[PDB]
Protein: Beta-galactosidase
Organism: Desulfurococcus amylolyticus
Amino acid sequence: TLLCGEIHYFRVPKHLWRDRLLKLKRAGGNCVSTYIPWNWHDPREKVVNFTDGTSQWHVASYYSRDLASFLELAGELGLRVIARPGPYICSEWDSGGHPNWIYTKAMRLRSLDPGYFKHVVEWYNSVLNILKPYVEREIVIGIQVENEYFWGNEKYIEKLAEIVEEKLPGVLVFTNEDPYLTRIPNTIDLYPSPWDMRQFDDRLRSYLSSQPGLFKMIMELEGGWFKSSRYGYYPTNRLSIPPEWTEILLKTAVGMGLNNINIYMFHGGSNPGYYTAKYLASSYDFEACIREWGELSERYYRVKRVFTFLNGFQELVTSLKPGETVKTASTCSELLQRVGDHGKIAVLRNTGDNLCYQRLINRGEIIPMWTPIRVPPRYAKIVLLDLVVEGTPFKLVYTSGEALLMKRLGDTVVMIIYGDHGEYTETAVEVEGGVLDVDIQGDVLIRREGERAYLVVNHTHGEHLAIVKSTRGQNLLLIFTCRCRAEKTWIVDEDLVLISNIYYIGDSRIDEGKVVINAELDEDSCGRLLVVTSREIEAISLEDLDLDLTRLSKYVYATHIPLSMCRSGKNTYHPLEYRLLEDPVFHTLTSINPSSPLEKNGFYENGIYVYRLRLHLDKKQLGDLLDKHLALIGFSDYAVVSINNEYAGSGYHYIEMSADSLREGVNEVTVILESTGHPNDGLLYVPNGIYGGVYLGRVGEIRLYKWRKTGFEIPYGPGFDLAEFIANPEPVIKALQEETYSVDSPGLYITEFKVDDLSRHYVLDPGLEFYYNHYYRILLFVNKVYVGPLIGPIDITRYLKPGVNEVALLVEWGVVNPVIGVYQYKVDGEWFIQEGLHGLIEEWFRRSPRGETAEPPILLGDKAGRVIWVNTVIPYEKEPTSSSPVKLEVDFWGCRILVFVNGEFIGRISDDSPERELYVPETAVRRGLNNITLLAIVTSRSSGIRGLRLKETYVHERKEIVFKLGLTK
Amino acid sequence: TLLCGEIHYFRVPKHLWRDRLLKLKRAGGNCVSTYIPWNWHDPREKVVNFTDGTSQWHVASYYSRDLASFLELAGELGLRVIARPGPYICSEWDSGGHPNWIYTKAMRLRSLDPGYFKHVVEWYNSVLNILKPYVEREIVIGIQVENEYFWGNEKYIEKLAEIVEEKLPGVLVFTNEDPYLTRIPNTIDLYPSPWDMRQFDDRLRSYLSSQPGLFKMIMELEGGWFKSSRYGYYPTNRLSIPPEWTEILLKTAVGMGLNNINIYMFHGGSNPGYYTAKYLASSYDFEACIREWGELSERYYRVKRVFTFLNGFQELVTSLKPGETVKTASTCSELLQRVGDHGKIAVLRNTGDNLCYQRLINRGEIIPMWTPIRVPPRYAKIVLLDLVVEGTPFKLVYTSGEALLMKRLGDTVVMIIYGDHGEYTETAVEVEGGVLDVDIQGDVLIRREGERAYLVVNHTHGEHLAIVKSTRGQNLLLIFTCRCRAEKTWIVDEDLVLISNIYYIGDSRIDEGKVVINAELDEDSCGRLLVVTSREIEAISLEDLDLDLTRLSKYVYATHIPLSMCRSGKNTYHPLEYRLLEDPVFHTLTSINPSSPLEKNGFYENGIYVYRLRLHLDKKQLGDLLDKHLALIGFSDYAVVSINNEYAGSGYHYIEMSADSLREGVNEVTVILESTGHPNDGLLYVPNGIYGGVYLGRVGEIRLYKWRKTGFEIPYGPGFDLAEFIANPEPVIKALQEQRSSTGETYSVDSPGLYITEFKVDDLSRHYVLDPGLEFYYNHYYRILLFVNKVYVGPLIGPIDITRYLKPGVNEVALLVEWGVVNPVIGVYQYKVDGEWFIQEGLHGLIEEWFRRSPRGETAEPPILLGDKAGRVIWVNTVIPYEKEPTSSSPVKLEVDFWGCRILVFVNGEFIGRISDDSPERELYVPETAVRRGLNNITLLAIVTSRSSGIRGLRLKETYVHERKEIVFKL
């Protein structure tokens, strides 16, 4: 009943909403799911925005807050909606959907702590008021509260659910991955690694045995995975999620009795500007069914065959219970079976790489009779048994083929059954009162016995037709097609099924006595088109051209799109020239207390910040220096540092520079810093900008080599509050009152190190391993005193005593390799902060001063620590279309690059990005001259831009197909 | 040390040999391996052919038997050769390499049976004479005898080895997958399934502790997999073999001590004409490193990184021994380790889908100091430890990066080290005499401690350089690059290394003060090029464009190819017009005895045959007839049948048709039949053509559902001769005569064993035909022995009339499954129809060479509907203008949209291959050698197999358009 895809209105240009949703509908989806992110609607703590307006430079004009329009569009296209308002959403999104002003109100995020929960009450009021009319009109059918509250806190979850129930009485309310709930329905999120089924099967089984009688759903069935900078890969951080894998998970879920399924993500789209979670790529492509740029991937067509089956047999599927009577002949495939009054499904699962030939035992009969069931490699086949065709004399005793769909056309029931090229299928039809006749088109062999017709078909690139005629004037029309044509079978309106090679059938409009269809043709979209309809078809036209039209039988017409109308086009577009202009950088600077977290000084945006530090060194300290290294320690996230107008260094979180630029008296330090967004864990406060400080002279280091792991149990359960435990870990303090080289799994780790000189400064660095977009929960204790959750480097000087000291880490979740840096001095001075850059504030991305021409390659080593604007013009002499989407590629090194097109922020790329390209949405592109603008922060003496290009992924042809209709009978 | 790729001279147009072999050379290959197929050189049992010419219509003019020229070309390009002359080769090849005349000479194939072996002695004489000069010149360094004789027969293998040792004294001689051999070296063939390492790891472990002291080699390391019609898939029958999988297998093999490895296939190419094994596609692309059309796949660049490492650290690799001195800090990756005096390798294997951060314990030191070792997902990383750079004061204590190569340039050692974009690596260099100085280009942080420099590097899209200088006269140049540029690092000779984005570097001409190299540029080939050389470079040109030249250090130059020079072209070429001509089919028909196989009538070619059957029915037979079905039963492989000038039916091996065109007296049956090739098992005789017969009136069936599996054991071992056991299964006859004990019943005959069932025969006037079922038929033919009432009938090869073995009442059938699966049923027929049979090889249009020059046909507007021509043969001629020079940098595939045909494809008179409804694709590679600039003649021969049949159209498609450009170094 719920055949759902995740599509985020906040990750899709508003004009492309229709394209993305209709592609899900055309796949047989009947529901779309989306988060409603609190920080998307209320970033500044002002008027909640549910309009098209943005107050943020980094959010392009075509991204919208108009949730009402998204919901109406879903309704108009025939989709229901699942709403996921948070307040936490995770979703690889800045602060997991928390507005960055929340960190000023509460430490105890994701709890009933009033400092947090009062703001959650006001958010739910704003958002549930917008949802209200759409719940009443039965478009919005489900509300998720919170998101993967793994740890229990039942009264937190129940309070959220009670507010939804007060505003929206009777609406289904649930959460995901909180197994400790008795009354609020729990739903599961499944992201197993390819090929071994046991972990997935075991999680489905436990979930199905849980919460007896409550709503059952997979709220996130793996539809791919996300991409990150720093530690990421293309096409996902987990490499390719095979489309074969996704289909096996879906068919396994159907085999085990889950008929409520949401693919996460179905379409991922793009992360607008600085709404990324920390380290997230600008792309949210997700290797999804619908790629970021709108492409229907192999994963789309496999999911489509499953959703089309589940949609065109909801009767049977809703009736099914767990079964055991059916058995297999061979061990070459597994069996998952379900049984209902009027039919069964046998799911034959072959996770191995060799084709399997299977038979079933159903009531002492070995089926099929003359041919085995093919189970392809890396495939699970749904086999239909004992299916009653209601209000007819027909029973489908079995098919060894795969049923796509079943449709009533007056006196005829049509079923489409598919197989591979060269597959033999066998279908047994039983007819009450006997078989009157069988008409066949193509290669069908018939055996008759009693009231049965047996049909043996050799599948090809085409359809074989069998009509089994009853004595009561009712007919069964079987259409045997290949898997490829089943994938490109399009159900338009209702009473029009197109069996084709056509890449995509979009909008349809039935006015006059005419159906107009918007087809998108790829290279392989030409050749044979079957039309299955009760409507009289007089003519089919493709632009001007009248197509050949054959009547194959009643309800079936054949035509062809000529092979010439399918093109193999793909174009690249080069800049006319490159102009350079240096950003002055400074614009608006204000005093700030040293190490004062940006969000506690009214700065709620990520993106670029500039610090000016005025730091004081005198005779005695320069005099006594034991080592000539300056350290900038504890910032989110990436900085380029200049000292006395000389480039010094760059990097993430913690940088060691040369001290040589240092003089006696005042030293000026410039920090150009990027915040890539907050993590998406939703519990910890990882402050934007410099939360740490400046240190001088590395005098040594203390490596925490070896740890004693001790049993410790976090009391996860319905009564547990994780936010309360992180803020007050009394049970750990208690355990501390009172072998392993790697701290990489849950538990309490203790080690001892020596301190000789307490005039030194001691900074614990959590190490490279610790930093992940879904931030780890690791609690730091120094000599049995709670320092806090690890968020970054931390000065632990004030917690140290002379001689033997103790460090303990309680890993609730994650990995860390800590090391202590020892510094001579902690440098002090006056601090100034700027939000943004002069060029951004002055909107140079909308209109740049004219700069100098430059011949590529553009060498930037001399501008290390500076900001360079690079403007180019690209001719694109056609209409921007979803039929021909464009990517911008930049060949550069030693830069953090912000990309704009015609003054719209497209995203960022850096040296540690998993790709050198961005999707340029059709809404940003114009026919003619296009302005491509790079803002380049220069991070190295080895730095440059070799070039850039706009690339078409493909060029598909948009064509209108017109059906001239006659009279229905 | 043997870094080998399988490339078959008989599957590559001769003009393209150089391209395929140089691409193997360029990957770091030092050896090419090839079968020499007996049936390729002696198909007709006449003068053994080692020339360019062909006796066969279906073998294009550009395929060669000139083995000498291949061996010469391999030698010229700096490659050694492993030769594998069979006599059996398997290789998805017709009869596994046996000439089809062998079936007239012997039943006991692959044995010392004289009827087989005397002909093996003549073949081995012809072929070892061709090889002798190349063994003496040290080009051919190994000879494989036989091929996967799994079952033992040591005296048979010994006898093949003796003939080789006598003609080519002291040449290395071995076989593959015969683990019962004590004296002759055995080698291993490994084709595991992605992601569980345990089966592969256990096979390697067992092999490495077999045969004390003898030659150790993986003679076939999975390079992909083949594709079949009927039961096959794209891109292989096992779907995609992931490129990450192939690299994990290679790195595992290195980590376990195997340094002799052959990738099967490195390049697969094409199966010429009817030299396919049964059911095989005309493509042998194999999803190989080099695709059939010449493309360098992702698999190629991954294998190239491994071969480059093994070549560039030869001294280290030769020295390594087992030893377990190193430990890992965490469980997120496994460790394989080898140790020598020169240093150690730690292979960190991560078969999971998450990045692992790893540390090593070496001495009592935790390695590295400031940075963890990245082990990427689905990856095995080779970490070097304690590497002594011989004749220098440098030790590489460790690098968390991956070492690609090491090269001496005068007083400087250069090492290339790689990682992913954004990877942090840590490298520890110890200098004896102490560290004079470290000069750096790029993002290299230095920590000096002892006589040690620690170098911490963020890997980028480009190179960071560190020159560590000794207080003596000697320098360590470290170049830190990304994986992608390591993959496109090209070694043009001893002192010319290009670190690049370039898709491929081909031939070089090392003139005087000029180096000219042929580059092939894809769309990502542009950007930075680094040149590492001892040579003085004044200028670098791309054709006529002089490039920017920066001197980075003494041995390192930097340049760039402008991003504008890398196009993204891709063109489709369309036919002008279609002309149709009906083949008259009949040309020359001669008498043949009913059921007499074609090889017993002097027909040794596969391909198309036409039978005319003159069958007699009298009034009585037709009057008494109980069921209206005619069956053609037992033929190889596919038939289209007409009765009294009406299309009756089509299919593989066993066809049931309507009997309604039949009438009293003579009935004229036309059978148009294709043999797709013999199977590649090399043991059984599966006859071409009609070996069964024609039956009328299907009056029932006996389903053989339920079997008793007994405890019979085939005695495999050094003394076992499997051909002798197949010919004379005496132990099975004895097992069948003894008391049965109680045993398990099964519905599945799918694993080795003796299976027994029982059925009722009520009427011995009927005819009983056993059908082995769809499951039975596989290109590598199964071995299942049929017994009826305890009498040996024979190995199953197809449907078999078993009537004469039956008695009234309860009958027994027993199957000894040596290997395979079967699901048999007995068809019961009223009559066996007798008459006179006639055979023709080919069709009128083939014999008269219409593919070389077609008569004028009628023009036809696509789509061309053929359903009214069911059972008949139609020639479709068209012209495709191709207005460029045919080139490997722009290869073409012919696509045909059709249904209900078997199609034979010719281009400019050259047989390209076959396509049918049950093909895993609708396209063929058209080699450059068949294409011409200007008008291309595309000719299809369509056997119409159905009343729903036609050709919608066809097109020539370029896979891609790369740019060919010379890079010129002025010295």
